[PDB]
Amino acid sequence: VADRYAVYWNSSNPRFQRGDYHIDVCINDYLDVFCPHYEDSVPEDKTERYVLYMVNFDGYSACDHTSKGFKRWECNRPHSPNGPLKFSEKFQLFTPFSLGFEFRPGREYFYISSAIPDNGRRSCLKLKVFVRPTNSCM
């Protein structure tokens, strides 16, 4: 893309229906997660809600955050005002804040989600982020 990567986190997105959704980024690039957004004319039953987790492979591969992940974001406002609720992740080297999230070139990172109303925790929506090595990034 460019410097910011928009990711629409819903089961209707073809990108997620292929099951291998991944993005190649460089340090200081951004990840913009757009939660599922529905107009007020929806019974909130077909409305999708998710809890997003940052996990490792085995968690990523098994769609399981237990003991292998941090709770990252919560898509719990299917009716937010200014369009879809958005969460952003900056792939920075060093965090300004105690215990912020740091990223390293040449490494892979993983996000999975579990439906709030719960569908079965089977084949979760997932995203792999590949932070390119310094050699690749310009």
């Binding site: 709770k71 952003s88 900056k90 060093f94 804040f97 215990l99 912020g100």
Partner: protein, 488 residues
């Protein structure tokens, strides 16, 4: 009480503050803490040397705020915990502010801002804090005043530190609406100057009043009411119940504005309605214009229980006693009047020639001497008893009283004295016994008694003067003192 003007943490990341330079310094980060979604402005350019990053808050309408308090919550990272870590790493950041009449919007000029203070962390975040998920959140508060212009900005300058701003909270202090001393005090703003004591007049709550000092409170800069002056009182018919004034209960009363409760109705009184200043009197009883409403209803007294009118000599002595019934009063006075009657038959008021040993009215004594009386005249004296409530009734309570000795001679003597006497036959029935007293011409005399009209004093000294008196006793009248001498 605190009025909030700015609260970052509560805005849910919708504030969108201005950063400078454009898209280089502070960034809006989002994370989860305590299972809650939170936002924060953070910056960590610890490797890039000279840093000068500004985060300016949105324009804050001042309103009535004079001194604002700024509460910052933040974390700062250990400069030692950076693999590289140039000597350009700082562990502080700067707090600025700027007053303004209007919102400059996207305009940002640093040199408009005045530095408030350097912000330093009590707790530094170390590298070990990282694998332990341990957040050391510092809390720092500053204050600036007096604010004078329509509004103001707050600005945060990073000079090369590893910081994240979790919370920004600006507020001013407000002396709370107050109910005290039966008065009401409006919510007022804490002045800006430290030695500020704003005098706030109070308003008497309903049915309350200032009797004779008017209620006043003094608002300090920290929002405390300091020194109370004056008060409102629950006036007549009202008392203090909790924090307000309430009408006196049925069967109670209150006559003045005091800090006392309602007194229950005294004796001989009629049950009172709510908010009574005094209980009405029971039938046949009264109260004086000086009696407290705690005093039972009273009434005029009865007559002086006893009255004696004795004509000892030429004067007449009037001796009486307090009434059997005082009517429940202690302010009893007596007054004496007189009638003349010639036993002629005609009668009339007493002459102006009659005197009293004491002004015949307003008597507190129970006796008076009457002098200068015409002989043989039948005088009738009336002594009246009156108390405080007498002037409130027409009736009178009084008692009346109207005002011959033995003629004695010597029938012979020796040495003894032979004595005889007499009184008109009509009087002879009245006398029970005659009492003969004989003393020697200072504290020792002899007295005998007989129903007859003659006695012989025996065992006397020769050529001696004796004082002899013969009194007529009844169930009385005594003669004059005679001097009889014995033989030689």
């Amino acid at each position: 009480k605190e009025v909030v003007l700015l609260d970052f943490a509560a805005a849910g990341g919708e504030l969108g503050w201005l950063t400078h330079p454009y898209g280089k310094g502070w960034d809006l980060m989002q994370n989860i803490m305590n299972d809650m979604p939170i936002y924060m402005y953070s910056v960590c350019n610890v490797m890039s040397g000279d840093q000068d990053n500004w985060l300016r808050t949105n324009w804050v309408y001042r309103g009535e705020a004079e001194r604002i308090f700024i509460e910052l919550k933040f974390t700062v990272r250990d400069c030692n915990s950076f693999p590289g870590g140039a000597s350009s790493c700082k562990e502080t950041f700067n707090l600025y502010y700027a007053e303004s009449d209007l919102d400059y919007g996207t305009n940002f000029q640093k040199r408009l801002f005045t530095k408030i203070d350097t912000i330093a962390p009590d707790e530094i975040t170390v590298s070990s804090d990282f694998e332990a998920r341990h957040v050391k959140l510092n809390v720092e508060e500053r204050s600036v005043g007096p604010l004078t212009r329509k509004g103001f900005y707050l600005a945060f300058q990073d000079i090369g530190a590893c910081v994240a701003l979790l919370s920004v909270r600006v507020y001013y202090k407000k002396c709370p609406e107050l109910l005290q001393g039966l008065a009401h005090f409006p919510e007022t703003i804490a002045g800006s100057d430290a030695p500020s004591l704003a005098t706030v007049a109070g308003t008497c709550v309903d049915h309350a009043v200032v009797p004779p000092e008017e209620p006043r409170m003094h608002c300090a800069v920290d929002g405390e009411w300091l020194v109370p002056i004056g008060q409102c009182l629950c006036q007549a018919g009202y008392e203090k119940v909790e924090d307000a004034c309430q009408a006196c209960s049925p069967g109670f009363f209150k006559f003045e504005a005091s800090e006392s409760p309602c007194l229950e109705c005294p004796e001989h009184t009629l049950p009172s309605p709510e908010g009574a200043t005094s209980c009405e009197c029971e039938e046949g009883f009264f109260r004086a214009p000086q009696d407290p409403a705690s005093m039972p209803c009273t009434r005029p007294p009865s007559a002086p229980h006893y009255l004696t009118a004795v004509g000892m000599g030429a004067k007449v002595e009037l001796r009486w006693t307090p009434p059997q019934d005082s009517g429940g009063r202690e302010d009893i006075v007596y007054s004496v009047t007189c009638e003349q009657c010639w036993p002629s038959g005609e009668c009339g008021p007493c002459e102006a020639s009659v005197r009293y040993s004491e002004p015949p009215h307003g008597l507190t004594r129970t006796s008076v001497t009457v002098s200068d009386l015409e002989p043989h005249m039948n005088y009738t004296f009336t002594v009246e008893a009156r108390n405080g409530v007498s002037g409130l009734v027409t009736s009178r309570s009084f008692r009346t009283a109207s005002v011959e000795p033995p003629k004695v001679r010597l029938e012979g003597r020796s040495t003894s004295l032979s004595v005889s006497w007499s009184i008109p036959p009509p009087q002879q029935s009245r006398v029970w016994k005659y009492e003969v007293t004989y003393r020697k011409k200072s504290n020792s005399y002899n007295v005998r008694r007989t129903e007859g009209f003659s006695v012989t004093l025996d065992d006397l000294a020769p050529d001696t003067t004796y004082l002899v008196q013969v009194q007529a006793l009844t169930q009385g009248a005594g003669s004059k003192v005679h001097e009889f001498q014995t033989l030689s």
